[PDB]
Design a protein around this ligand. Structure first.
Ligand code: CA
Ligand code: CA
Ligand code: CA
Ligand code: CA
Ligand code: CA
Ligand code: CA
Ligand code: CA
Ligand code: CA
Ligand code: CA
Ligand code: CA
Lengths: 655, 655
């Protein structure tokens, strides 16, 4: 940048020069009236060019050369190194009139060069490079640049309830590891010249998006000063001479959302004191941008780490069988004895990542009159959105995400978020706008709405799931299918099994004596399920379109529903599609289907679909402890997974 | 898109087929239990493939071929032409058991193919093409596509006060010329099959962004039905058979703004009636997107059309001299006898453009307790923003725009909007957020804030302007300069002119007897103006940086200011920089500077700068009628210009 500095008639001008700029200097205005020509001298480390109407000529430190005084004849002044105490950096201009070669007057510019750079890791390698020329912009993609900031939503110490970003204080040194580094690098003499100061600042708007800390090491121990953030928009910096660095730590206070893109900026300015009651003049300003990292969901294809399970203390079979399942894997089991399903419905495990750090972050379902904060801890973060009135579609059983897909040649390397909804003109239920807006604003999972509102509870996880295909990079969509169930039952009936009984061993179902015959004869139930199959098929088509799937990528699992007064579906027998996926190993809800040759024909049918693909099936009984099944499951599971290997910032989301 | 349609055990299925899709058809679920194989027949215009686990084979209309019944063996069904009354389009599947070649059952699919396409001019040539494959997206640039919509902000007939978009009604046929065309094209037999209907719809959110009209031609005359818009989210379409087109007219109701990107969408769906109390199933949906055209400012380099002037009836010299100026050009003069400057301060002439049409649109300064609507008329539109409390910086004397520039290789083909502000930490005045947000949201003029708050009134047009360089494609920035003035006055003083008097002929200034000597001796005035020159120079640097300008692109015009109690500047003599620019011809405020040899030395100095470039100067006296000059101008001018030749939609704004 070129900066304007005029010589003053006829008084000396003293100026700070900031490296990486240069000055254009008017010598004409300072010339006494009548003066004809000028000459100049300058010191060793000041470079001076005479520019006569666009044409620039370098000038020696002490020459005798003279030029005609003209408004279009000016100086360009450059310095390549900061001043020291040994410095006298100056330019002096002499003026002459027509008669005689002795100067009639002189004007001069005394300069103090300093280096000022606000530096961040914009090349995203975790170390803070010196003055990245792109540090003031933020670009997506493999070739993209600009610095990344985490929302500091975890909690370092248990003694306080709230996440670390809720206040202006830092207690634990460990907190700083969650934070991005920003360094103010300076070089100069012992002191700034009289009337200058260096100031860091942010906008009022960004003041609830960030906080910035300085670490001091005084006598009695380390301390962390919050210098920018809520109710602090600027901070006057103490200047140290020589080559100096001030290290700052930056935290994000909130995720991208409706009305907040995720971009924030921090400035440093050299300000010049003019006089009392006059604002200070920014002489030089340097800017860095951060993008706050989005919250990202993990699909079922990612490696499992921890299986979280909730259930009543005495459901023994569930616990034994889940423990057995997880023992086949390298996962940890965590058990808790909020709704009965709350672990599945009230929380979603995502993560956040920056080049320096990442941790899992729990999303909490909208209020359940009380928030679930109990999982908040070190490197396990929390976030929530508070509405609009909440419906069953706001539960996170209604929130899932696909494996990475490519659609019409557009790649979605993090998969796509899926949420159940109702038809546009239906006047049906829909997830609250506040949560939908949140998921959309994260941008990197490009959410798709499915149709879940034909279900009483209304959750996409009632009808669909994804599983990896072992020994490959591929995956399958699993879809509930009533037609598969009817086909299977009609076969078994034809085979002479019509009297085969379901719900065997559930004592509270026994008096119903439900058989294949009894099911197939129920005419209204047949019509209800043909209609439910239309709802499933409408979803199938959306998924195929928005995920770029073919029929080869889909397996249909038999399912059956009963209709309520709102013409919405609830499971007739447990929905097998909502299953625990740990790589090749699948916990599948035990269906309690008709027994043929002392095996459940639904279990055998599901094994016949999945086992040839190398998937290993374990059926998990969560209903026996209740003696019957009315369409509700009383247990829940949630799997916490490793983040994607692909870095979110390498994605290029649509405008 | 592939769509799922199942044969039904064992009942016939009737379905609408929409051209541009195809069906995947399950024949397995409809097979009776025990059946082994199936065969099929189909009609002439239905194309049928047997797809066995991914492998597709075309099948004849009546063959005898049989395939093994499998869940993974399905049909793919395609049609290339809409059904007519002569059509019987069908596929029939026969099932066989192990014993015997006579069918044991059959299932069939009866089809009615129709074409449904919602079409817009997405290739931006003004005509509505058939089903543009890109019509559902909107992309910037020369290769970009998607349809454009004007805010219909003008007023067709004087009998109503409000702009045409304020209501849901259309009166004049001429209104439709402002509107974008959207055509629903259909092809099919005499009627849709039982249980279907076609519905146009928009989101609740877009309902205040658009309105859509259908033109009817009943008996007693043409009429315009508003079918989508405020409080109408959907409209059931009347289906006509054969090849049919329904023509719709679309208007935008508002400009892009904070929280509204400018993009809106309109849908059509074929809905299937399921049963009472059940929502209808969207079978097929087609979508078009519009972008509402932004409001665009015109810089001084664009051809002038009309010069608007306001002044008191008896300021005769001003009127005569302005009339004389405009007579040198091809422009029209319009005179009006709100503030004294209101024409300059309360209105800004912009425009809007779509491929089919464009018109000028006036922006009205925020409330002046009353809006200025008097310019609202046919193809002259109005828009305003209502705050925050208003200050002098909200006036449009504080709103200007540069000529097209390139900066760091980034092109700004429409120039950049410039608005005066205060330093960030100053606590000074700033244009209201509501107007700033508005200008920013237009995106194509990428606004820059300058520093105007050192001026009492606080307007960028007090210190700067742009002029074209005649006979070239180039332009100059003109900057007020106090240093230029002091240099000139000190010269004239040295020349023996120190007693030369300013304000000659202004009787109310006479007793002051202000001379060059009196000015140059005033020490505090010298310091005030050195400080004002620092403010001007700070702006110079911003303009050079953000407009990509060098010192070769800038001319300094002498100016002088007095300081008030807030340390803000007001003109000492009229600011010559704020001038009427009509191509080569410039109306320049008459300065009333010191007379040397019976000519104003400020006028002569300005001629010496500008005339060599082919600029013709006319000095315009607006102050003589007031007998004195206190720093306020009582007249205003605004020039309405031809829009840029460059089409805004060819620009590629930053993300
Ligand atoms: Ca780095
Ligand atoms: Ca904290
Ligand atoms: Ca932390
Ligand atoms: Ca941490
Ligand atoms: Ca979930
Ligand atoms: Ca077209
Ligand atoms: Ca209207
Ligand atoms: Ca109109
Ligand atoms: Ca019109
Ligand atoms: Ca203006």
């Amino acid at each position: 940048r070129e900066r304007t500095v005029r010589l003053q008639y006829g008084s000396r001008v003293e100026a700070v020069y900031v490296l990486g700029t240069y000055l254009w200097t008017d010598v004409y205005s300072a010339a006494p009236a009548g003066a004809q020509t000028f000459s100049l001298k300058h010191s060793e480390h000041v470079w001076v060019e005479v520019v006569r109407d666009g044409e620039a000529e370098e000038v020696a430190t002490n020459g005798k050369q003279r030029w005609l005084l003209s408004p279009s004849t000016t100086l360009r002044v450059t310095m390549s190194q900061a001043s020291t105490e040994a410095s006298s950096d100056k330019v002096t201009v002499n003026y002459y009139d027509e008669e005689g070669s002795i100067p009639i007057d002189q004007a001069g510019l005394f300069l103090t060069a300093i280096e000022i750079s606000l530096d961040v890791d914009a090349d995203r390698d975790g170390v803070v490079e010196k003055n990245n020329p792109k540090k003031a912009s933020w670009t997506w993609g493999p070739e993209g640049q600009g610095a990344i900031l985490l929302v500091n939503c975890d909690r370092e110490t248990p003694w306080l309830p709230k996440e670390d970003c809720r206040d202006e204080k830092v207690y634990s040194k460990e907190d700083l590891k969650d934070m991005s580094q920003m360094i103010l690098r300076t070089k100069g003499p012992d002191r700034l010249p009289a009337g200058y100061e260096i100031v860091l600042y942010i906008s009022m708007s960004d003041s609830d998006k960030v906080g910035v800390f300085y670490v001091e090491n005084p006598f009695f121990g380390q301390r962390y000063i919050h210098i920018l953030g809520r109710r602090k928009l600027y901070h006057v910096v103490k200047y140290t001479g020589g080559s100096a660095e001030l290290l700052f730590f930056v935290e994000g206070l909130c995720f991208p959302d409706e009305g907040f893109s995720g971009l924030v900026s921090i400035h440093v300015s050299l300000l010049e004191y003019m006089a009392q009651d006059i604002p200070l003049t920014p002489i030089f300003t340097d800017t860095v941008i951060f993008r706050i990292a989005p919250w990202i969901m993990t699909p079922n294809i990612l490696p499992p780490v921890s299986v979280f399970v909730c259930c009543m203390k005495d459901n023994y079979l569930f616990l034994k069988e889940v423990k057995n399942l997880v023992e086949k894997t390298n996962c940890e089991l965590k058990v808790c004895f909020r709704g009965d399903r709350w672990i599945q419905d009230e929380i979603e495990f995502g993560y956040i990542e920056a080049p320096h750090k990442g941790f899992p972050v729990v999303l909490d379902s909208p209020r359940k009159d009380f928030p679930v904060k109990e999982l908040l801890g070190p490197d396990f973060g929390y976030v929530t959105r508070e509405p609009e009135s909440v419906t069953s579609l706001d539960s996170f059983g209604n929130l899932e995400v696909s494996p990475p897909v490519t659609v019409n040649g557009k790649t979605y390397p993090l998969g796509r978020i899926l949420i159940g909804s109702s038809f546009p003109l239906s006047g049906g239920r829909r997830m609250t706008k506040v949560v939908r807006d949140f998921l959309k604003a994260q941008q990197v999972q490009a959410p798709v709405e499915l149709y879940s509102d034909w279900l009483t509870v209304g959750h996409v996880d009632e009808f669909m799931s994804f599983v990896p295909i072992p020994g490959t990079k591929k995956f399958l969509l699993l879809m509930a299918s009533t037609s598969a169930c009817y086909k299977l039952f009609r076969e078994k009936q034809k085979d002479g099994h019509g009297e085969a009984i379901m719900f065997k061993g559930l004592g509270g179902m026994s008096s119903k004596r439900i058989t294949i015959n009894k099911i197939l004869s129920n005419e209204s139930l047949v019509q209800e399920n043909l209609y439910f199959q239309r709802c499933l098929d409408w979803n199938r088509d959306i998924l195929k379109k928005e995920l770029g799937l073919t029929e080869q990528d889909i397996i249909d699992l038999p399912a059956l529903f009963k209709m309520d007064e709102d013409h919405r579906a609830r499971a007739f027998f447990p929905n097998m599609v909502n299953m625990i996926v740990l790589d090749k190993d699948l916990g599948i809800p035990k269906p309690f289907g008709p027994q043929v040759e002392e095996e459940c024909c639904l279990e055998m049918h599901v094994r016949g679909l999945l086992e040839p693909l190398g998937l290993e099936c374990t059926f998990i009984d969560d209903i026996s402890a209740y003696h019957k099944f009315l369409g509700e499951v009383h247990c829940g599971t949630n799997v916490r997974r490793k983040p994607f290997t692909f870095k979110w910032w390498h994605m290029v989301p649509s405008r």
